[PDB]
RNA sequence: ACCCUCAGAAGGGAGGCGAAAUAGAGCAUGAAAUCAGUUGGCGAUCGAGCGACAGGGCAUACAAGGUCCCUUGACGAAUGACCGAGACGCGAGUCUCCAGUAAGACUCACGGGAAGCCGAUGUUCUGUCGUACGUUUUGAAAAACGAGCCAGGGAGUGUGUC
RNA sequence: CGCUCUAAUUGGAUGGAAGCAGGGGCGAGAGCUCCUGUGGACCGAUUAGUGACGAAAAUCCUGGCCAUAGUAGCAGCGAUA
C-alpha cells in the first residue's frame with residue numbers, strides 16, 4: 001500500500017485512507033481533483049448528487065470519447081462515476097467519524113489533501129478468438145485524505 | 151550557537167606566478183561536457199562518454215553542432231592538471247599516519263568517506279596543528 | 293485609431309519595393325514607421341504583366357489557404373512582410389510596429405526618402421497600386 | 435490490548451511493541467521504466483533529431499566549489515586608426531605625414547561593489563550550426579532494415595599441432 | 597579506465613560499510629573522489645595474478661511498466677422477455 005505523501009499536525013488535522021479498492025483509478029483521479037479545496041460536507045453532498053446524476057465530475061485527463069456535459073465549468077467533458085463516488089463517500093464518512101472523536105466539526109473541515117494511487121491490478125484473463133487469451137484486469141486503488149481546521 | 155568548520159577552511163597555497171596563471175586559464179577556458187552522443191534522446195543511453203563508432207555518425211564525422219569529440223588537444227596544462235580550484239594538490243588520508251610527508255603550503259587534505267567520526271576528530275585536530283587544511287571539515291555546534 | 297509613429301513616409305510616386313526595403317531596415321533598428329498614401333504608390337513595368345502576376349496570386353490557394361490582399365492597403369503591408377523575417381520573435385515585433393494607410397490619417401505630411409521617387413516626366417511605363425486593385429476586384433474607397 | 439468507525443476477524447483512525455513498523459506478514463535494502471499529489475521554469479499567435487557552443491530571464495538552506503562586476507592604472511602579439519596639414523583623381527575615393535602612435539586579447543595592482551552574488555544545477559528566451567542511433571550501400575534523414583520504454587540477461591573459449 | 601576471485605604488503609567501519617537518491621570537486625576521457633539523506637553490515641588501496649569481466653542495437657531472452665483507453669466486446673442466432 002501507500003503512506004501519506006504529506007505531513008500533518010494532529011491538533012489541527014484528521015487523517016483517513018482507502019485500501020486496495022477495486023474501482024476505476026481514472027475516475028478516482030478526477031473525483032479527487034474536484035473535491036480538493038471543498039469542505040468535507042460540501043464534498044459529501046456533491047458526491048451524493050453525482051450518484052443521482054445531477055452534478056458531473058469533469059473528466060479532464062481521461063476524456064477520450066466522452067460526451068460533453070452542460071453543467072461542467074471551464075471544461076467540456078464529464079461523467080457521473082457512481083461506483084468510485086460511493087467509495088469516496090466511505091472515505092469521507094470515516095474521516096468525519098475520526099474527526100468527531102477528537103472533538104472536531106467534521107462537516108466543517110476543508111480537504112487539504114486527496115490523491116489516488118494505482119496500487120496494482122487484480123489479474124484476470126479473457127478467452128479471445130483463435131485459441132488466444134488476453135488480460136482482463138481490475139484496478140486496485142488506494143486513496144488518502146487529510147482534513148484541516150479552517 | 152552556530153555551526154563552525156574545524157580547521158583552516160580559509161587557507162590558500164603559495165604558487166608560482168606561472169602556476170597561478172595556468173590555473174586562471176583552466177578556470178577561464180574550461181572544457182565541454184563530453185557526454186555520450188544522443189544521451190538526452192534515450193534513457194538507456196548513459197551520460198558517460200563512448201567513442202561515436204558509427205560510419206555515418208554526425209558527431210564522428212565532425213559536423214558542427216553535434217558536439218565535441220575527445221582529443222589530446224583538449225587536455226589541461228601539465229603544471230595545473232588535477233589541482234583543486236583553490237590551487238591545492240589533493241592528498242587522500244585514511245588514518246592519522248597518512249598526514250606524514252604533507253606540505254601544508256602546497257598540499258591540502260581529503261579524508262575518505264569510509265572513515266568515521268571517532269577517527270575523523272583525531273585526523274582533523276592533528277591536521278590543524280600541523281598547518282594543513284582539510285577540504286571536507288566536520289561542522290561543530292559552537 | 294491613433295498610432296505613435298516615429299517616421300511617417302509618403303508613398304506618392306515612390307517605387308514600392310525600394311520604399312518597403314528602407315521601411316523594413318528601419319523597423320529592425322527599432323523605428324515605428326507609418327506608410328501613408330499607399331493608393332498613390334507605384335510599381336514600374338508593363339501594366340499587362342504586373343496585373344497577370346498579381347491576378348495569379350489571387351487564384352492561388354487551397355483548403356489550407358493563401359490569402360493575398362487585393363486592396364492597395366495590404367499589398368504594401370505584404371511586400372514589407374516579404375522583407376522581414378516575420379516568423380521570428382524580432383521580425384514580428386518590427387512588422388507589427390509598421391502600418392500602411394490609404395491617404396493620410398494624420399496632419400503632418402510624410403517625408404519622401406532618398407532614391408525612392410520616380411520622375412513622371414521621364415517615365416510612362418508604370419502602374420498605380422489603386423489601378424492594380426480595381427483590376428483585382430476591390431472597391432475604390434480612397 | 436483497549437477505544438472510536440464500519441454491514442464487517444475487512445479496511446480506516448487513535449493507540450500499543452521495538453534501536454527501527456517507510457522492519458507489520460512475498461514484511462533486509464528498494465534502482466529504472468511509470469503513477470498520483472506537489473514545487474520551480476514554460477505555457478492556449480505558434481514549427482518539428484529534442485541538442486553542442488555563446489549569451490540573457492527566472493529559480494536555489496547548509497555541506498562537498500568560491501569567486502564575480504565597475505572607475506582607474508601596469509603590461510601590451512598579429513593587427514591598427516579618426517581629426518588635422520600637404521599633394522593627386524571626372525568620380526566614388528587615394529597617396530604622404532601625424533604613427534606602427536591611439537587602440538589592442540590575456541594577466542596583474544590600488545580603490546570601490548555584489549553573496550542567488552560567481553561557479554554550478556533546473557528551465558526558458560536569443561545567436562550559431564543542426565533532416566537520430568546502429569546496419570546495409572557507390573550513395574541513408576530516407577518512402578532500405580531494427581527497436582514501444584526500462585531493468586537484468588546477452589557473442590574470440592578449450593585442447594592438440596605448426 | 598572499470599568488473600570478479602586468489603596471494604603478498606597495508607588500511608577503513610555500529611563515533612555507521614557496501615548499495616541507492618540528490619548535490620559539490622577532478623581527469624581529454626574510460627572513470628576517480630567528497631557532502632547530504634537513506635541504509636545497518638560489511639568495504640578498500642598498492643603489487644603480482646585469475647577470468648562465465650564492460651551493451652543501445654541481434655523481428656535478441658526474461659521481467660516489469662506506459663500510451664493505446666475508460667476505447668472494442670458484454671446487440672446480430674426464427675429462442676427479441
Ligand SMILES: [Cl-]
Nearest residue numbers: 025026118139
Ligand atoms: Cl488505470
Ligand SMILES: [Cl-]
Nearest residue numbers: 221222225624
Ligand atoms: Cl594525455
Ligand SMILES: [Cl-]
Nearest residue numbers: 353354357358
Ligand atoms: Cl485559398
Ligand SMILES: [Cl-]
Nearest residue numbers: 377378379380
Ligand atoms: Cl521568417
Ligand SMILES: [Cl-]
Nearest residue numbers: 414415416417
Ligand atoms: Cl517609360
Ligand SMILES: [Cl-]
Nearest residue numbers: 171175540541
Ligand atoms: Cl594569461
Ligand SMILES: [Cl-]
Nearest residue numbers: 589590591649
Ligand atoms: Cl578478438
Ligand SMILES: [Mg+2]
Nearest residue numbers: 064065066067
Ligand atoms: Mg463518443
Ligand SMILES: [Mg+2]
Nearest residue numbers: 129130131132
Ligand atoms: Mg479453441
Ligand SMILES: [Mg+2]
Nearest residue numbers: 189192193195
Ligand atoms: Mg539518459
Ligand SMILES: [Mg+2]
Nearest residue numbers: 457461462464
Ligand atoms: Mg520491505
Ligand SMILES: [Mg+2]
Nearest residue numbers: 570571572573
Ligand atoms: Mg545498392
Ligand SMILES: [Mg+2]
Nearest residue numbers: 605606642643
Ligand atoms: Mg602493498
Ligand SMILES: [Mg+2]
Nearest residue numbers: 586587650651
Ligand atoms: Mg551487464
Ligand SMILES: [Mg+2]
Nearest residue numbers: 568651652653
Ligand atoms: Mg554497439
Ligand SMILES: [Mg+2]
Nearest residue numbers: 064065665667
Ligand atoms: Mg480511439
